[PDB]
Design a protein around this ligand. Sequence first.
Ligand SMILES: Cc1cc2nc3c(=O)[nH]c(=O)nc-3n(C[C@H](O)[C@H](O)[C@H](O)COP(=O)(O)OP(=O)(O)OC[C@H]3O[C@@H](n4cnc5c(N)ncnc54)[C@H](O)[C@@H]3O)c2cc1C
Ligand SMILES: Cc1cc2nc3c(=O)[nH]c(=O)nc-3n(C[C@H](O)[C@H](O)[C@H](O)COP(=O)(O)OP(=O)(O)OC[C@H]3O[C@@H](n4cnc5c(N)ncnc54)[C@H](O)[C@@H]3O)c2cc1C
Lengths: 217, 214, 215, 214
Amino acid sequence: MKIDILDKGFVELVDVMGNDLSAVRAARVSFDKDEERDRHLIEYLMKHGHETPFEHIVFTFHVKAPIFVARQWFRHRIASYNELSGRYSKLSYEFYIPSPERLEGYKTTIPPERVTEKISEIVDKAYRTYLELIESGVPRRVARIVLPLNLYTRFFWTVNARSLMNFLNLRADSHAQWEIQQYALAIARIFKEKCPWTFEAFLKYAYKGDILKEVQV
Amino acid sequence: MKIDILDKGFVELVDVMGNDLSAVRAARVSFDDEERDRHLIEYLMKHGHETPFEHIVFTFHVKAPIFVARQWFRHRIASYNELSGRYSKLSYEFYIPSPERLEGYKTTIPPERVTEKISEIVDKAYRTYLELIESGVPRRVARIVLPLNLYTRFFWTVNARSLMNFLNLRADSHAQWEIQQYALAIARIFKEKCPWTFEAFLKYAYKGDILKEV
Amino acid sequence: HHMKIDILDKGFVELVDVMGNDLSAVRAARVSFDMEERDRHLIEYLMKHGHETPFEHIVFTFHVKAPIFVARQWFRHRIASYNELSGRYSKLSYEFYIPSPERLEGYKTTIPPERVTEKISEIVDKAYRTYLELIESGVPRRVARIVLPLNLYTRFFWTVNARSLMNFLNLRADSHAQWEIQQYALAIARIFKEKCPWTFEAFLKYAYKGDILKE
Amino acid sequence: HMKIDILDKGFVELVDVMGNDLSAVRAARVSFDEERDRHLIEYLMKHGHETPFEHIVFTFHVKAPIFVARQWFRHRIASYNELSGRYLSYEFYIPSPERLEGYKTTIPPERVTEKISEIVDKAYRTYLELIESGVPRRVARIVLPLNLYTRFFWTVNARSLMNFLNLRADSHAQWEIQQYALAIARIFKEKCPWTFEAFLKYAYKGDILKEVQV
Ligand SMILES: Cc1cc2nc3c(=O)[nH]c(=O)nc-3n(C[C@H](O)[C@H](O)[C@H](O)COP(=O)(O)OP(=O)(O)OC[C@H]3O[C@@H](n4cnc5c(N)ncnc54)[C@H](O)[C@@H]3O)c2cc1C
Ligand SMILES: Cc1cc2nc3c(=O)[nH]c(=O)nc-3n(C[C@H](O)[C@H](O)[C@H](O)COP(=O)(O)OP(=O)(O)OC[C@H]3O[C@@H](n4cnc5c(N)ncnc54)[C@H](O)[C@@H]3O)c2cc1C
């Protein structure tokens, strides 16, 4: 399961431990099936705020996102992150350039395409300066500081279903920046595919945002 | 995988996400060479880059006396669900130490009389509990007379980094013997699922004594 | 900063220290050094819209004496710091929570509540005397102590931020919780209200999920 | 408030503190003579009993470049509130020539300082054009470079502060965050001298705080 996001971004599922029944077994503390009874229990748990059983469902995602999105993402502390660094992995340099349609709606004094062109221009210049600095023996740790906040980074994120639901409450919401809403929608889609019963109960009883009640998946 | 502990306890493995290669993939941040990969695991452990190990996760089902569970639940970086009578049925079993457990100390009464005195109190506390319940005292009030050797059960979901910290503290000869025995079983399952990480842990990061002796 | 509230027969919650007050959350939210109508309005705005991170910058330390059955539930709250009494550093005393007869009304028990209290006293006394005899005989405390009942009192220090404290109250200041833990939660609430009145009142108005704090 | 200037425009400032060395002593004894108390601190640190140090808490106000803030925010056992724009000002970290001498480079270090400064100016001017044109700040700002300064409040307990110093007060860390860690250390040492000295003797894994005073 890999979903493209923005112009060069993605969310890819690496691994998953458990499913809806993992929360049911944890609640009962039994490693021991009755679909209607198990679904009823998931709804009951969610309705009455017994959220600890959902901590026993765990996901690992591989996310490629711009730094300004990652910085918001990394504010979610009840999770594990490893970000790409030059020490273990080859680095590549790509940048998020908003399309004009991202920008029309805002009343601006120049055409939205001219905005896109200006952003692409300054990114091109900053990257050229960086490469020029690296070419000259400036270490990458120093030279990278000129690079803009729309630089893509990648990370692995391991997170349990409860903390994933908190992430959606905050980021799958029209108050959040549009870019991280788009990532949260992808995260929601993957969560729904793997834990459909927990996801549906979440939407019915626990979810505090707007977008996942109006946008399917 | 299930390991019996104490007289009626156990540690069983419920689920696991990942293996040694999950830490390797996380460090390199890539989803899509045996010896190079082992060398990376060792390199991460010896330099303290421990975050990649967070991407290996276990769920265990543990049955343990309350005094053991109390120490275990101090490990905050993990997830717990403890048996409740609201969702499942309760049983009443108690840990009675064996007479070998007290061989070591120069006790005034034989170790078998110690075992017997403990059994005796458990029987009396349990029968008082039952008498209160039969009288109409709610279970949540009645149960307060029950002893700390009463067995409880719990699910424990924990990542490999936190599990290592747990072994550092509990797989150690200064910890209480009973929790040592649980820590040894935890260690055994960890080793079976993540042999490379386990080995690098012992070599480079483990601070206790018992895992290098048994 | 010092307050102590007696709970149960021999228990208590004592305030050891506090960092900050309501304005600490206002300063955190703005990243500033403000030190009123605007400031209250902001606290209410944060609480209403669930922006709770500013409340993490208010921190309490409590000293709590509670029975083991209460402490076990309490220590389930992971986003906090605990240090529990140890014979390694401090002398140990042996006290137990005996419920009063009034605790056992509503309940239509087949023996009088006074006799329920007395039976609990008896079995506790026998357990403690067994513990003492085992200790007297050379049994280590770590082993002998396993016969002691769940109503044995322990003590601990609890350091916790206001956000986590509000989560605590949501769960424990609730009529579905055991009456004993409710009594401890009410004491925690009491101290929290006294030190952070604006946050506490906004919590009650907008975020508190329980029933007993508004009765 | 102790305010320590770091880099060209940065700082670390102490907003508040709860407790001092005696708060860890109280917590260890669970109970509300200097030499006995100092001895307990050393005993705790030596034998790994670190939970008592969780009862000393600091709140700091930090102004740092984004590339430093992003490393800092990886420390999860802490509370952060960062400037956003609807509860700003625009300064940038420009490395000094002396910062860059010591690497073999093909142009003088002062040229490098010059080229960073020029690209920053261009990115800033573009950002200002976009804002003037009606582009919201939250979109326009994505052209700004990683050396833009931000500000945040950090609340952190002494145990977690010590883990932060283990990782950031070390020569393998980026020099810029080392500078910030030295200032955090100075403030820690002033408020908690016995804990700090004990940390250096028994627990600190880094190098720089053993060579560099404060
Ligand atoms: C010799 C010795 C004697 C001890 N005696 C006692 C005693 O008398 N009383 C007592 O109560 N405890 C005592 N302990 C500690 C007790 O055993 C705890 O149960 C145990 O320390 C839990 O380990 P943890 O905090 O490392 O694990 P977790 O709670 O899982 O934490 C894992 C790691 O995360 C970090 N962490 C998590 N939460 C926080 C936080 N809130 N603040 C800062 N860092 C955090 C720490 O780095 C920690 O090591 C003693 C420990 C030792 C070694
Ligand atoms: C030599 C070296 C190279 C590194 N290179 C990289 C890199 O390329 N990319 C990268 O992303 N990071 C890298 N790091 C790690 C990164 O710097 C850490 O994210 C940061 O230092 C935070 O440290 P911490 O996890 O101890 O702090 P906190 O997040 O404050 O945690 C404090 C303590 O709590 C415990 N803890 C907290 N949360 C959890 C949890 N969810 N599960 C288990 N235990 C927990 C741990 O015991 C930890 O020590 C590297 C580290 C080292 C030592």
